[PDB]
């Protein structure tokens, strides 16, 4: 009785939203950026190759100094590299070897990991004792953690395979806010530059815009055909790119609230594991299952270059804060820095 | 290089040595992935052989066995099943006393899960030890409730031997492309201490194949 009425009302509201966001599409991004000169051909070369991991790399995160980076592998290791000298700073042994994510704090005093243990571990990198020790274990999720991102030294946002994101308080150990609007497993997180809001991509082929302070969903974006595995804000904070198992990347605008462009090629059939943006936002770097990375022109959706050099699946990649280099990890147990 | 840079290089070398030692230690352990239903019987298997996922460590005849139970992960397993790409074996438990029971028959749910795991692209050449637990309840219950409830096309004698053989054949027939992996089937009860020997025998074959692969000739 009432369930059918509510379903009809939901369908009417969805149609209203679709009509509203179809009436503000007077042009496309391809049409506007058709008169700008394309970037010719990006020839990045492997400046550094970081060796030492003995299993699959599942995550990496650059530090804010653009020199130190953290990497997570199933060998039970969290390794911190000094990318200039290619020498290791710390090697943290995890209690659970099934790591799927890692984060580097903006201050540089903490690291985070998590995975199939359903716990986010925060390690203090700077102690009077010379070792790195577990400072906090955050245990409130009923599913595996797929991404963690520091807001500051005390707030961390996590996304889990229990169809839920969580904003925590590291000192008290309790999750301050719970974001629950998804249907499938949330696989990726991305923080906005202003820290006031973030975006989550899930296994229900949807992306959601979460307000951190309020705790509710602002907008939902639905243009993908399969699981969303990676997500990344544009440097402006008014757009974001998503990657999915359907071999497509996608640009969504927050203010227009719809798709802008699709980055896909008929020669690409494998899924996307990572997306990142250049410092200016002109390039879009996507890591693929077909063992290599692709550099697209974010304003024209054409393949500017190919970063080949990995023997297995590319799992994670990130661009430094100064835009100097890209770091790509893979299942072949190697990290590579490109410039 | 400066003095501090040289000391940093020395620290990195020590870290490399420790990582190599830990990798050598971890490459000699046998990894088992325990799969099954909650009432299928894995707690009995664990007890005989000894939130998140549960890790059980045991030792049997100069081997260290790490058993990973992922039953608490009530999520889309297509997003974390590749974490066990390199695993020595998969121990799949089925309680063959659930043919009558219903959660959709439990037995068909076990069959579907076995079909998904056996034919997964991450386990093309991974051995499967198939445990068929609760044989005593099956023998007691086969007299009253016939196997026709689970298999309408059975058409066989209602004895323990024939029904057990039919169950084993039905599970082994789900193995599409049954030339690139081996399936070991054992019938077990609660009061039975022979399962560690069965797992050891199954793992020995995998080790032989693995260190023939290391020695070039596959």
């Amino acid at each position: 009785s009432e369930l059918d009425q509510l379903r009809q009302e939901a369908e009417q509201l969805k149609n209203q939203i679709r009509d509203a966001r179809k009436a503000c599409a007077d042009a496309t991004l391809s049409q506007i950026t058709n008169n700008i000169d394309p970037v010719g051909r990006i020839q990045m070369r492997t400046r550094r190759t970081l060796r030492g991991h003995l299993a699959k790399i599942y995550a990496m995160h650059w530090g804010t100094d653009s020199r130190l980076l953290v990497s997570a592998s199933q060998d039970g290791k969290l390794i911190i590299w000094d990318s200039y000298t290619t020498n290791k700073v710390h090697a943290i042994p995890l209690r659970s070897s099934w790591v799927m994510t890692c984060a580097y704090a903006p201050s540089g005093n903490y690291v985070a990991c998590g995975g199939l243990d359903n716990i986010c571990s925060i390690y203090n990198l700077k102690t009077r004792e010379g070792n790195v020790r577990v400072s906090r274990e955050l245990a409130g999720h009923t599913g595996y953690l797929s991404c963690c991102r520091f807001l500051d030294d005390n707030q961390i946002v996590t996304s889990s395979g229990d169809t839920t994101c969580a904003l925590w308080d590291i000192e008290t150990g309790q999750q301050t806010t719970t974001f629950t609007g998804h249907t499938g497993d949330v696989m990726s997180l991305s923080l906005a530059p202003d820290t006031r809001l973030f975006v989550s991509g899930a296994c229900d082929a949807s992306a959601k815009l979460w307000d951190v302070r309020e705790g509710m969903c602002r907008q939902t974006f639905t243009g993908h055909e399969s699981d969303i595995n990676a997500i990344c804000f544009f440097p402006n904070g008014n757009a974001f790119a998503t990657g999915s198992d359907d071999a497509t990347c996608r640009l969504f605008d927050l203010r227009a609230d719809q798709e802008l462009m699709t980055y896909s090629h008929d020669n690409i059939i494998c899924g996307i594991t990572s997306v990142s943006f250049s410092k200016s936002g002109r390039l879009l770097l996507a890591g693929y299952d077909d063992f290599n990375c692709n550099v697209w022109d974010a304003l024209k959706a054409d393949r500017a270059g190919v970063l080949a050099g990995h023997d297995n699946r590319v799992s994670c990649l990130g661009v430094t804060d100064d835009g100097m280099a890209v770091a790509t990890g893979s299942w072949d147990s190697f990290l590579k820095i490109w410039n | 290089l400066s003095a501090e840079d040289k000391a940093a290089v020395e620290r990195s070398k020590m870290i490399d040595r420790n990582l190599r030692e830990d990798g050598e230690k971890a490459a000699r352990e046998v990894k088992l992935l325990l799969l099954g239903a909650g009432e299928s019987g894995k707690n009995t298997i664990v007890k005989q052989m000894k939130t998140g996922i549960v890790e059980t460590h045991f030792t049997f005849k100069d081997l260290h066995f790490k058993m990973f139970d992922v039953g608490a992960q009530r999520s889309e397993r297509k997003k974390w099943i590749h974490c066990f790409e390199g695993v020595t074996a998969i121990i799949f438990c089925v309680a063959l006393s659930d043919y009558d029971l219903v959660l959709m028959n439990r037995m068909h749910a076990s069959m579907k899960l076995f079909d998904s795991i056996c034919n997964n692209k991450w386990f093309t050449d991974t051995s499967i030890i198939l445990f068929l637990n609760k044989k005593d309840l099956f023998e007691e219950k086969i007299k009253k409730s016939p196997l026709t409830i689970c298999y309408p096309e059975y058409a066989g004698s209602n004895t323990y031997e024939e029904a057990a053989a039919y169950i084993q054949c039905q599970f082994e027939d789900l193995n599409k492309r049954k030339d690139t992996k081996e399936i070991y089937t054992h019938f077990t009860c609660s009061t039975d201490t022979k399962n560690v020997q069965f797992v050891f025998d199954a793992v020995t074959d995998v080790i032989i194949k693995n260190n023939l692969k290391d020695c070039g000739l596959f």
Epitope: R128 | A7, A8, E10
Partner: single-chain antibody, 232 residues
């Protein structure tokens, strides 16, 4: 976190003695260790260095081949074995903890040292100032000069400013010029270029009255500079 010294005392000339230092409170195996001595009324002087893993050992030319360094990681004990003790070996011996990675703070913890009395191509670091009269609340600058550029090609300047209060072991203030050590008030700052360096105290209480020392870590044998005393 502490490093407690042991040994020392009065030695007839030409003898041998084993100074010890027990660590308690930190991961001793991952910390390089130094022995640094101070004459009864003179300034500091670096004696020896042994790295984590016992793979690198450096001695000062004044005791090279005469002193020996060693470490027992399970026992957390650092040893200095001294043979043929000359009368120029009478001093206070300090065990210094230092760790070296990117962004480290070498020379950040010191023991209390052991007194030792014996009975009857090196960079020169210059501190021309000495016994500067200071009033509380003022701003003070301490100058330092080097006989070589301390700026390496990596972009680092290996100047260390330590503070030794009257009756206390020296404490790190700055480890690479303008880098402020942990637990030090923000009223301290450092500036410099090449062979010239200044350490500035903006407004000072009675706690930071003592002797300030410059130290070069560009290359061994880690020469010090005669300290500049602040007098109230």
């Amino acid at each position: 976190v502490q490093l407690v010294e042991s040994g020392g005392g009065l030695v007839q000339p030409g003898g041998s003695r084993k100074l010890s230092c027990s660590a308690s409170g930190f991961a001793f195996s991952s910390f390089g260790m130094h022995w640094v001595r101070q004459a009864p009324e003179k300034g500091l002087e670096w004696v020896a260095y042994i790295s984590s893993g016992s793979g690198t050992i450096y001695y000062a030319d004044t005791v090279k081949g005469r002193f020996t360094i060693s470490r027992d990681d399970p026992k957390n004990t650092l040893f200095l074995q001294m043979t043929s003790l000359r009368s120029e070996d009478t001093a206070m011996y300090y065990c210094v903890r230092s760790i070296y990675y990117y962004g480290s703070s070498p020379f950040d913890f010191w023991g209390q040292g052991t007194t030792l009395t014996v009975s009857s191509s090196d960079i020169v670091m210059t501190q021309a100032t000495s016994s500067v009269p200071v009033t509380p609340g003022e701003s003070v600058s301490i100058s330092c000069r080097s006989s070589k550029s301390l700026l390496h090609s990596n972009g680092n300047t290996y100047l260390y400013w330590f503070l030794q209060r009257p009756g206390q072991s020296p404490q790190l203030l700055i480890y690479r010029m303008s880098n402020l050590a942990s637990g030090v008030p923000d009223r301290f700052s450092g500036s410099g270029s090449g062979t010239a360096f200044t350490l500035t105290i903006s407004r000072l209480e009675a706690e930071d009255v003592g002797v300030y020392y410059c130290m070069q870590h560009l290359e061994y044998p880690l020469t010090f500079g005669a300290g500049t005393k602040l007098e109230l």
